Symmetry: C3
Subunit: 33 residues, 3 copies
């Protein structure tokens, strides 16, 4: 259970580079310049 | 605390349906890749 | 290990108010309620 918590935080840290690229894709389509 | 980490990670995971609806509403208004 | 798990949950909580500010910047770039 501790490793399978750690693996599912890591998948947290990884989705959170992906969304934190997606938000700055979208804001920079919405013309923030 | 491990279970009240697991359920309150699961509640992390449940948002990633809603955010990944909203990011793909927005980018797909923007007509986009 | 568990305390430094709990701190990186708390960072879950901080990013999931931050992203839910970013999505509501994006709505107010979309002209939207």
């Amino acid at each position: 259970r501790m490793k399978x918590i750690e693996d599912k935080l890591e998948e947290x840290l990884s989705k959170x580079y992906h969304i934190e690229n997606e938000l700055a894709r979208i804001k920079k389509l919405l013309g923030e310049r």
